[PDB]
Write a protein that binds this ligand. Structure first.
Ligand SMILES: [Cl-]
Ligand SMILES: [Cl-]
Ligand SMILES: [Mg+2]
Ligand SMILES: [Mg+2]
Length: 506
């Protein structure tokens, strides 16, 4: 019985944390980043990188559970607005429905780029009464997402409490959705109507929001800057709160207690050879903020010991590894407990989305505001602007802008649905599963890949010294979308049957 706007807001707050917990607690890493080849470990979920995932994989069931937790929580909030409010304003009621529908849209948009067809649900009771329900078609899922985002665009405000969604966030996601739909199973061209809509929504955010990119890329990934102006939407973790409200990734991302102030950790992930090669030589700011590499210095990690220099010869994760409790983290670093929010949408994504929507079906983009906003991302990274861009420039730029943010894989699926032959060739040329013992730098700061001789000091350079994977799979169309989780298929055999049309309620 919610009797004030603030009481209702307390009920919608878990849409930003608890709802996402089953996904964030584990599977976000191998699905969003691993599968894109952002990083690799031979012991932690390598199958996601090498395309050898089985239906029994715990990450599939966890992700499925997490995304459906968002959907069903959203549905519960919408129901509560309509049945449990008694002095509550229409502004607050519509804001709550809008936040619920925004999150539901985000969950379905992730699922669409993991499994493809999924079950669309607006009535939780229908699911309870009969859980054996059919999949709906990819086109239905797109329309459902669009409808939810339309409501959020119309019913969120331009400004919000810090950490809460605005209409700019909804418009930014909607731009991404239209861009993703434009080429999806569309014979190698992008629908001009969807391109136009993507441009309209993205340009509105870029030109009119009054928001800007943070001056320093590294600042985006520090806890003191949670909910900075570039953060359009993020999971809002509560490190001093309940277990289901915490960001539990700290120990799985951090490679050594030397970068956690002594807090227990166990990561064996390293940035992939392919991913590391995406950073242009001049792009050291984004590279350093994403992965540690030999000799890189961090003034803001191990602050009490004058900063931190990585002295290993691998490429462990930096993004998501905020240092120890006293590294401007207000004591909020503990085992499996990170103070960082998890980004869902940054303004730089909208900039790059606008650029890609301006490129459209042309082979190059050499003028216009889309190119300007692409070049703002370059400028913020302190590297050269480009006088013209192609889709290949956009692919590279997105990988380096969003490395270790658990987003690159979803973008790669979108591209595969547009240009499947190009992207299968791309995936097969990423050297997935290859890793190497030693990555070092020369005088000019360029990375070199190889291993040490028996003496552990004499560097041997080149691919002949890489560690090859046990198996290199030829990646094909059938490999891209993941299988439905086996336990869920047992409970609902229609997950093995064709999708059917959704009956829309609007
Ligand atoms: Cl796979
Ligand atoms: Cl510390
Ligand atoms: Mg279509
Ligand atoms: Mg095969």
């Amino acid at each position: 019985f919610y009797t004030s706007d603030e009481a209702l807001e307390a009920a919608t707050a878990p849409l930003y944390n608890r709802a996402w917990f089953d996904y964030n607690q584990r599977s976000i890493v191998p699905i969003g980043s691993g599968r894109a080849n952002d990083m690799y470990s031979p012991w932690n979920y390598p199958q996601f990188v090498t395309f050898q995932v089985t239906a029994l994989d715990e990450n599939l069931s966890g992700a499925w559970s997490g995304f459906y937790s968002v959907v069903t929580m959203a549905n519960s909030v919408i129901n509560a607005v309509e049945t449990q409010t008694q002095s509550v304003s229409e502004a607050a009621k519509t804001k709550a429905i809008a936040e619920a529908r925004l999150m539901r849209a985000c969950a379905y948009f992730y699922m669409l780029r993991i499994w493809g067809p999924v079950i669309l649900i607006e009535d939780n009771q229908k699911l309870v009464d009969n859980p054996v329900r059919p999949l709906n078609r990819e086109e239905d899922v797109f329309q459902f997402i669009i409808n939810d985002l339309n409501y959020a665009v119309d019913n969120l405000s331009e400004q919000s409490d810090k950490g809460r969604a605005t209409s700019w966030a909804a418009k930014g996601i909607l731009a991404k959705v239209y861009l993703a739909r434009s080429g999806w199973n569309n014979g190698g061209t992008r629908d001009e109507g969807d391109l136009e809509l993507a441009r309209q929504y993205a340009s509105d955010v870029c030109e009119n929001s009054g928001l800007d990119l943070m001056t320093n890329y590294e600042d985006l990934f520090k806890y003191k800057n949670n909910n900075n102006q570039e953060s359009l939407l993020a999971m809002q973790w509560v490190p001093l709160g309940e277990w289901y409200e915490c960001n539990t990734l700290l120990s799985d991302l951090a490679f050594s207690t030397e970068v956690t102030g002594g807090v227990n950790c166990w990561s064996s992930y390293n940035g992939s050879i392919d991913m590391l090669q995406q950073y242009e030589l001049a792009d050291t700011l984004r590279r350093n903020a994403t992965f540690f590499t030999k000799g890189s210095y961090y003034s803001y990690i191990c602050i009490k010991d004058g900063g931190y220099t990585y002295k290993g010869t691998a490429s462990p994760i930096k993004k998501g590894v905020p240092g120890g409790p006293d590294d401007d983290n207000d004591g909020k670093v503990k085992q499996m407990n990170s103070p960082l929010n998890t980004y869902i949408l940054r303004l730089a994504d909208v900039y790059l989305t606008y650029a890609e929507a301006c490129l459209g079906n042309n082979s190059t983009l050499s003028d216009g505001r889309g190119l300007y906003f692409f070049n703002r991302v370059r400028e913020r990274a302190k590297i050269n602007k480009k006088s013209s861009i192609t889709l290949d420039d956009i692919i590279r730029e997105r990988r380096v802008e969003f490395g270790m943010e658990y987003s690159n894989w979803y973008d790669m699926v979108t591209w595969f649905r547009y240009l499947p032959d190009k992207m299968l060739n791309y995936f097969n040329n990423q050297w997935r599963g290859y890793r190497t013992d030693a990555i070092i730098k020369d005088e000019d700061g360029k990375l070199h890949f190889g291993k040490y001789d028996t003496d552990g000091t004499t560097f041997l350079e080149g691919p002949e010294y890489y560690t090859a994977p046990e198996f290199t799979i030829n990646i094909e169309a059938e490999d891209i979308f993941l299988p439905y989780p086996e336990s869920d298929v047992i409970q609902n055999p229609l997950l093995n049957e064709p999708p059917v049309p959704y009956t829309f309620n609007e």
